[PDB]
């Protein structure tokens, strides 16, 4: 007997820790074309889709009915659905066919057709197509800012370092629900310290988040969830109508927001209706369209552990990204959640969206060590920053991030650490000792952060939400504290709600608080010689990484 050492070494390989499984269609445990997915089809009578993917209006479920009456261009569907799935896949990759041309077609097809189109493509084709269907011409990036202790001092600090690194969108969340207000606050203060114009969100319970925004503590919301089956939607505590009203609610306040969905959600929650993950996700992205929501966050997202477990699951993630794009939605393409113990494996998953580029390559890059990631970890975290920069330089691919000197960051983290400290004084919140501002400036993660009186904090939070604190109150606390600069920056963020410019598809802000969206920065890729190309300035920044030695 005796065993092979070769096989012992492999057995010990990290990748072998990842939960993989065989396909089980009955329970939706399959990435694409489940034997139970319907066949694409459509029929219209007097301006009303009377049949949708094999089902007559008679048997429409809430989702069906919503998609049929809100997400499909009833006038052109009949003719559009006459095109073969493969033919649309071909236009998707045809440098002679334009973005707008396919949009006119895809906005007139069905959830089954969209999936059927993806079935005809390899990842290279999808990547090829993706770099053309992307809404905004310049790819961007979103990061996560959180920590095990929902510690405000470290959040502000991290948000500053994340902003100087390049993220235009920052997301926080909490271990203890009651901490939200504080977290949204430090994220807001910190975000403007690193790079003025940074958008910020606090992902919590739907009704609680809408209120945080209404109080000017956040500038956008993304995790406004949508699901592919009724059963799951209910367990999500929403309906296409309540979720669509919520969307208009945000806009009615001048707030930017997007929906969140992703492959694998329904199966993990137990009601897939024995459908494939991509098909169900397909319905999700059409709900997003139909609701009037400008953007979508998908690509398995939090359920990457699901879609990743089965065959062609990563190709699936990319495919769901493309369906959203070719459907003309802004796309924050995940890459935000852990799914593998292998660097090799997690890199290939991200490369799918990095290489071609999306509105937001990462819709949750962890700007802090993963042990601090309150979203259970991201596909890439702060300890990967040096690598991510080297990749961009390696392949001449703008990843949406730049290198930074220890000095620039230490200083930025201190300014934000003090800024938030001052805010707590003025507002009369549990003091932030200098030893804290100190720790958070040279800290990596919450391991270097001295404890805080939770009870005290939570208690204060409650008090603050009674006092009815607003972003404007934060503006002031900053002016009276000497940080006129951040105060005016936060004010400019709130101002966005007045112009309503950052409500357009793929909208973000620059240093002067000017909008940059798919409207005034249209993507126009049409094969070599066109579309985005890193600017000379941007290339110089990517190449010139600290430590690169001059050969001479």
């Amino acid at each position: 007997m005796k065993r092979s050492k070769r096989f012992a070494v492999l057995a010990q390989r990290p990748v072998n820790q990842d939960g993989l499984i065989g396909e089980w269609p009955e329970e939706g445990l399959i990435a694409m074309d489940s034997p139970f997915d319907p066949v694409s089809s459509v029929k219209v009578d007097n301006g009303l889709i009377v049949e949708l993917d094999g089902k007559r209006r008679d048997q429409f479920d809430m989702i069906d009915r919503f998609i049929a009456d809100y997400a499909i261009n009833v006038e052109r569907t009949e003719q559009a659905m006459r095109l073969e799935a493969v033919e649309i896949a071909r236009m998707l990759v045809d440098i002679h066919v334009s973005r707008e041309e396919i949009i006119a077609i895809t906005t007139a097809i069905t959830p089954a057709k969209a999936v059927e189109v993806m079935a005809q493509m390899n990842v290279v084709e999808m990547m090829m197509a993706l770099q053309k269907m992307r809404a905004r011409r310049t790819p961007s990036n979103q990061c996560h800012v959180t920590n095990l202790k929902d510690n405000p001092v470290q959040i502000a600090a991290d948000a500053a370092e994340a902003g100087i690194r390049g993220f235009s969108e920052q997301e926080t969340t909490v271990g203890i629900a009651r901490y939200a207000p504080f977290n949204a606050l430090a994220l807001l203060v910190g975000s403007q310290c690193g790079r003025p114009g940074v958008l910020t969100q606090c992902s919590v319970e739907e009704a609680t988040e809408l209120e945080l925004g209404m109080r000017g503590l956040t500038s956008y919301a993304e995790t406004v969830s949508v699901y592919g089956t009724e059963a799951v939607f209910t367990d999500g505590d929403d309906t296409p109508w309540s979720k669509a009203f919520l969307a208009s609610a945000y806009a009615s306040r001048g707030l930017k927001m997007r929906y969140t969905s992703g492959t694998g959600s329904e199966a993990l929650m137990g009601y897939s209706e024995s459908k494939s993950m991509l098909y169900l996700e397909s319905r999700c992205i059409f709900i997003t369209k139909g609701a009037g929501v400008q953007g979508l966050q998908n690509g398995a997202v939090s359920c990457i552990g699901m879609t990743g477990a089965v065959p062609s699951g990563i190709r699936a993630v990319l495919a769901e990204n493309l369906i959203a794009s070719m459907l003309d939605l802004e796309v924050a393409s995940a890459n935000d959640q852990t799914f593998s113990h292998s660097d090799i494996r997690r890199t290939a998953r991200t490369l799918m969206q990095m290489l071609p580029g999306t509105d937001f390559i990462f819709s949750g890059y962890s700007a802090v060590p993963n042990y601090d990631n309150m979203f259970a970890g991201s596909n890439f975290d702060a300890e990967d920053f040096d690598d991510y920069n080297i990749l961009q330089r390696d392949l001449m691919v703008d990843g949406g991030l730049r290198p930074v000197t220890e000095a620039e960051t230490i200083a930025i983290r201190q300014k934000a650490a003090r800024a938030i400290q001052a805010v707590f004084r003025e507002l009369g919140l549990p003091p932030i000792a200098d030893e804290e501002v100190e720790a958070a400036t040279y800290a990596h993660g919450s391991n270097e952060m001295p404890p805080r009186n939770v009870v005290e904090d939570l208690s204060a939070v409650e008090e603050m939400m009674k006092r009815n604190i607003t972003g404007l109150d934060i503006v002031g606390a900053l002016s009276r504290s000497g940080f006129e600069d951040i105060a005016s920056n936060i004010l400019n963020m709130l101002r966005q709600r007045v112009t309503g410019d950052y409500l357009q598809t793929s909208a973000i802000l620059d240093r002067q608080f000017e909008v940059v969206s798919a409207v005034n920065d249209i993507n126009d890729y049409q094969g070599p010689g066109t579309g985005y190309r890193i600017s000379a300035e941007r290339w110089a920044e990517i190449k010139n990484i600290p430590g690169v030695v001059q050969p001479d």
Binding site: M62, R65, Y70, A71, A104, T107, A207, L210, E211, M214, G216, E230, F233, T234, D237, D238, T239, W241, S242, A244, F245, A247, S248, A249, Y250, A251, S252, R253, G254, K289, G290, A291, G292, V293, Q294, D328, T470, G471, L472, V475, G476, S479, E484, A487, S488, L491, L494, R495, R497, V498, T499, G500, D501, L503, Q504, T505, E514, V515, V519, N520
Partner: protein
């Protein structure tokens, strides 16, 4: 032309009537500008509505116009209507009463039909409050 900010912002108004040009750091400090001011007017939403439909993004334009009808409604009432649209919270008569309020008290014509449609859908798909 877009963005609306840069191009003639002297006519961009908050729902309160204050010009965008008034939302200054000093006026917020002087207590003049308040929380009820930093918001969007239905005129502004109607503008983006147009920008979007001219980009073939009609669906989003519809949302913006839907949102416009909700600007006057109090924040606490928005939260209430949203919560009431959630699964099992309401009975058919209660959603239909909200549709009545929306139409005649807020003149949110399109939001009123939206709710009357949910009422019908929750009825067919059994999403109305438990029983009675």
């Amino acid at each position: 032309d877009y963005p609306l900010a840069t191009r003639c912002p002297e006519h961009i108004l908050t729902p309160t009537g204050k010009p965008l040009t008034d939302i200054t750091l000093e006026k917020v400090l002087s207590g003049e500008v308040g929380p009820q001011d930093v918001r969007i007017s239905r005129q502004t939403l109607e503008y983006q509505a147009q920008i979007a439909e001219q980009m073939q993004r009609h669906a989003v334009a519809r949302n913006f116009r839907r949102a416009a009808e909700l600007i006057a409604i109090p924040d606490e009432r928005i939260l209430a209507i949203y919560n009431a649209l959630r699964p099992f919270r309401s009975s058919q008569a209660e959603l239909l009463a909200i549709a009545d309020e929306l139409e005649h008290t807020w003149h949110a014509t399109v939001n009123a039909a939206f709710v009357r449609e949910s009422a019908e859908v929750y009825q067919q798909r059994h999403k109305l409050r438990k029983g009675s």
